[PDB]
Enzyme design. Structure first.
Site, mmCIF file in Angstrom:
data_model
loop_
_atom_site.group_PDB
_atom_site.id
_atom_site.type_symbol
_atom_site.label_atom_id
_atom_site.label_comp_id
_atom_site.label_asym_id
_atom_site.label_seq_id
_atom_site.Cartn_x
_atom_site.Cartn_y
_atom_site.Cartn_z
ATOM 1 N N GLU A 1 -14.177 20.524 28.410
ATOM 2 C CA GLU A 1 -14.665 21.000 27.091
ATOM 3 C C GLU A 1 -13.804 20.417 25.966
ATOM 4 O O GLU A 1 -13.167 21.137 25.216
ATOM 5 C CB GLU A 1 -14.719 22.528 27.074
ATOM 6 C CG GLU A 1 -15.557 23.070 28.222
ATOM 7 C CD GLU A 1 -16.235 24.411 28.023
ATOM 8 O OE1 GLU A 1 -15.653 25.269 27.328
ATOM 9 O OE2 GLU A 1 -17.345 24.599 28.598
ATOM 10 N N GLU B 1 -19.778 22.821 35.575
ATOM 11 C CA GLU B 1 -19.414 24.233 35.312
ATOM 12 C C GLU B 1 -20.651 25.028 34.877
ATOM 13 O O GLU B 1 -21.306 24.622 33.911
ATOM 14 C CB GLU B 1 -18.345 24.315 34.221
ATOM 15 C CG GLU B 1 -17.739 25.688 34.087
ATOM 16 C CD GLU B 1 -16.696 25.815 32.991
ATOM 17 O OE1 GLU B 1 -15.858 24.903 32.818
ATOM 18 O OE2 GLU B 1 -16.724 27.016 32.246
ATOM 19 N N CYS C 1 -21.774 29.500 34.585
ATOM 20 C CA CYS C 1 -21.528 30.938 34.864
ATOM 21 C C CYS C 1 -22.352 31.824 33.922
ATOM 22 O O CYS C 1 -22.964 31.270 32.979
ATOM 23 C CB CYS C 1 -20.037 31.260 34.775
ATOM 24 S SG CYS C 1 -19.359 30.979 33.122
ATOM 25 N N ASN D 1 -32.075 21.324 36.107
ATOM 26 C CA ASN D 1 -31.086 20.227 36.250
ATOM 27 C C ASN D 1 -31.662 19.141 37.177
ATOM 28 O O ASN D 1 -31.638 17.953 36.788
ATOM 29 C CB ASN D 1 -29.727 20.760 36.707
ATOM 30 C CG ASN D 1 -28.883 21.301 35.570
ATOM 31 O OD1 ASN D 1 -27.956 20.645 35.117
ATOM 32 N ND2 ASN D 1 -29.176 22.497 35.098
HETATM 33 C C1 LIG Z 1 -16.406 27.038 30.862
HETATM 34 C C2 LIG Z 1 -14.903 26.951 30.561
HETATM 35 O O1 LIG Z 1 -14.337 25.641 30.803
HETATM 36 C C3 LIG Z 1 -14.137 28.032 31.334
HETATM 37 O O2 LIG Z 1 -12.741 27.984 31.005
HETATM 38 C C4 LIG Z 1 -14.638 29.412 30.962
HETATM 39 O O3 LIG Z 1 -13.931 30.416 31.685
HETATM 40 C C5 LIG Z 1 -16.143 29.546 31.198
HETATM 41 C C6 LIG Z 1 -16.586 30.949 30.737
HETATM 42 O O4 LIG Z 1 -16.215 31.132 29.344
HETATM 43 C C7 LIG Z 1 -16.941 28.415 30.492
HETATM 44 N N1 LIG Z 1 -17.010 28.564 29.047
HETATM 45 C C8 LIG Z 1 -17.979 27.944 28.333
HETATM 46 O O5 LIG Z 1 -18.828 27.207 28.866
HETATM 47 C C9 LIG Z 1 -18.060 28.160 26.816
HETATM 48 C C10 LIG Z 1 -16.870 28.937 26.224
HETATM 49 C C11 LIG Z 1 -16.965 29.093 24.696
HETATM 50 C C12 LIG Z 1 -16.025 30.166 24.178
#
Ligand SMILES: *[C@@H]1[C@H](O)[C@@H](O)[C@H](O)[C@@H](CO)[C@H]1NC(=O)CCCC
Ligand SMILES: *[C@@H]1O[C@H](CO)[C@@H](O[C@@H]2O[C@H](CO)[C@@H](O)[C@H](O)[C@H]2NC(C)=O)[C@H](O)[C@H]1NC(C)=O
Ligand SMILES: *[C@@H]1O[C@H](CO)[C@@H](O)[C@H](O)[C@H]1NC(C)=O
Ligand SMILES: *[C@@H]1O[C@H](CO)[C@@H](O)[C@H](O)[C@H]1NC(C)=O
Length: 494
Positions: A235, A337, A339, A367
């Site tokens: 990111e 990534e 979630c 995807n």
């Molecule tokens: C992906 C991130 O790299 C990881 O560190 C986070 O724990 C996870 C959940 O927040 C992912 N975050 C995001 O994709 C966006 C976060 C914006 C605040």
């Protein structure tokens, strides 16, 4: 085979309860006889990847939904599926008794589980850590003489990765991503907040950071682990934002371009790790195709970039993934990534959420329909709070560990991911699948290296949908997609 022990936490579906002596598992894999198909089914009502078999029929009539396989319409080849061995994941797994640990790792990595073949490894600390550390915290150590792996690597992450690889029959690919550099390489002198590398690409700060990648790979190689790929930065857009709360390192697309061309590309290429692949972006797909245009229209950068890594959090597919494939067809797209737990009015962990399962399988299908070669979950395991996480950025995970009960819970997300990861080996090729009429189903077809077929069908509606799948080589699969179900279909074609 051992079935799911179901438990309700009062949400839409059940979790499967596992402990030191019991976990749900498959029989060894088998192929369906020519003229027959295999069906694996999961439902909100509580079926969990249940196996049945039916006949492939010579003939079909009806005004009913038909999905026709187009085996000569060939798209991307699949790299694989897996999740992230974070500090949080490893700490939660190793807090279980050794037998429970083994059943958790078998659930993910065994052919008697869902056959994960990718592990994403953070380079030092991230939000899913219980402290901030890098591998080189001695200020102004440009030679990296005090580079070392702490206990988080040597006692938690590395031993669990060795055990995962020992349990897997498929070769597993490791992917590494950094969140932050040492603070003395950064303009803001902090692990978090708005800040980039000091100076300019080509200079000592940028060279030291590239050499940090090589020291990481050297240290993992001393522990007999080799990497498939690294990302340029997790990111990079995060470190451009004032007050960003956890570990980040800002790059504009131009800075990433110049870092890869001047520093990271050459440094990796001149190392004993030259075969490790480099993925760019590792961020929200909303940054495409602009990021890919900036980086890959520079030949000095493009010759070092194997792929584009995308994150699933803030998600329109054709305009981002589609247009990027069109501009750069020979540069693979990879989902690094994904979630859930983002919903302001819902808990971070919703034990037995069928909705969160459907979010995973829908995302994977979208995807695969837009050129993506692989899909990587975030934390392999979290606690019932969705932690630990040093900034309280709690999220959900396909496996929830209850350390006080020496128990872990397999969420619907686990089975939704399994409907893909178990049945789509590395080298599978997505092929065409055309519907005869507008319908509410999500489906995708692929062909295994050996020529056999796999179709996944997701029904996110409440209504049963009768359907037929036509494969001109063998005939017609007559089936039903129940409401709030997901099916995987497998058949030999000769
Ligand atoms: C992906 C991130 O790299 C990881 O560190 C986070 O724990 C996870 C959940 O927040 C992912 N975050 C995001 O994709 C966006 C976060 C914006 C605040
Ligand atoms: C681990 O989970 C298993 C399966 O749910 C538990 O085994 C069951 O124990 C109950 C006792 O109340 C029996 O009635 C069932 O027949 C058992 N099922 C099986 C398949 O063995 C086991 O007790 C759990 N272990 C712990 C430590 O709680
Ligand atoms: C840095 O390295 C030197 C030389 O090996 C060592 O003596 C010192 O303890 C290190 N500092 C740390 C680990 O804080
Ligand atoms: C590239 O690698 C060689 C051999 O390891 C090394 O001697 C050389 O210094 C490296 N190139 C540069 C310009 O540092």
């Amino acid at each position: 085979a051992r079935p799911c022990i179901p438990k309700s936490f009062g949400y839409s579906s059940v979790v499967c309860v596992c402990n030191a002596t019991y976990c749900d598992s498959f029989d060894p894999p088998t192929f369906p006889a020519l003229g027959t198909f295999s069906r694996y089914e999961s439902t909100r009502s509580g079926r969990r990847m249940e196996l049945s078999m039916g006949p492939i029929q010579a003939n079909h009539t009806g005004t009913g939904l038909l999905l026709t396989l187009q085996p000569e319409q060939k798209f991307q080849k699949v790299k694989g599926f897996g999740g992230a061995m974070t500090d949080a994941a490893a700490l939660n797994i190793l807090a279980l008794s050794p037998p429970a640990q083994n059943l958790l790792l078998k659930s993910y990595f065994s052919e008697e589980g869902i056959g994960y073949n990718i592990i994403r490894v953070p380079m030092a600390s991230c939000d899913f850590s219980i402290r901030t550390y890098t591998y080189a915290d001695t200020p102004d150590d440009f030679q990296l003489h005090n580079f070392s792996l702490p206990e988080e690597d040597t006692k938690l992450k590395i031993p669990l990765i060795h055990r995962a690889l020992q349990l897997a029959q498929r070769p597993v690919s490791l992917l590494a991503s950094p969140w932050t550099s040492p603070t003395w390489l950064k303009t803001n002198g902090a692990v978090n907040g708005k800040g980039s590398l000091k100076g300019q690409p080509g200079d000592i700060y940028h060279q030291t950071w590239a050499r940090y990648f090589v020291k990481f790979l050297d240290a993992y190689a001393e522990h007999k682990l080799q990497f498939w790929a690294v990302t340029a930065e997790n990111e990079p857009s995060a470190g451009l934002l004032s007050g960003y709360p956890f570990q980040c390192l800002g790059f504009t697309p131009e800075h990433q371009r110049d870092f890869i061309a001047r520093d990271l590309g050459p440094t990796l290429a001149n190392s004993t790790h030259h075969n490790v692949r480099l993925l760019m972006l590792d961020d929200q797909r909303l940054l495409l195709p602009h990021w890919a245009k900036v980086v890959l229209t520079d030949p000095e950068a493009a010759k070092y970039v194997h792929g584009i890594a995308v994150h699933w959090y803030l998600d329109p597919a054709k305009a981002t993934l589609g247009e990027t494939h069109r501009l750069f067809p020979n540069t693979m797209l990879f989902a690094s990534e994904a979630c859930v737990g983002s919903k302001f009015w819902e808990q971070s962990v919703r034990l037995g959420s069928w909705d969160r399962g459907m979010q995973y399988s829908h995302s994977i299908i979208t995807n695969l329909l837009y050129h993506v070669v692989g899909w990587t979950d975030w934390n392999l395991a979290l606690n019932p709070e969705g932690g630990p996480n040093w900034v309280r950025n709690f999220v959900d995970s396909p496996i929830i560990v209850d350390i006080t009960k020496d128990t872990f819970y397999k969420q619907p997300m686990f089975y939704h991911l399994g409907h893909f990861s178990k049945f789509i080996p590395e080298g599978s090729q997505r092929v065409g699948l055309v519907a005869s009429q507008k319908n509410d189903l999500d489906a995708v077809a692929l062909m295994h290296p050996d020529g056999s077929a796999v179709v996944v069908v997701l029904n996110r509606s409440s209504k049963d949908v009768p359907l037929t799948i036509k494969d001109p080589a063998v005939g017609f699969l007559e089936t039903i997609s129940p409401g709030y179900s997901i099916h995987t279909y497998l058949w030999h074609r000769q």
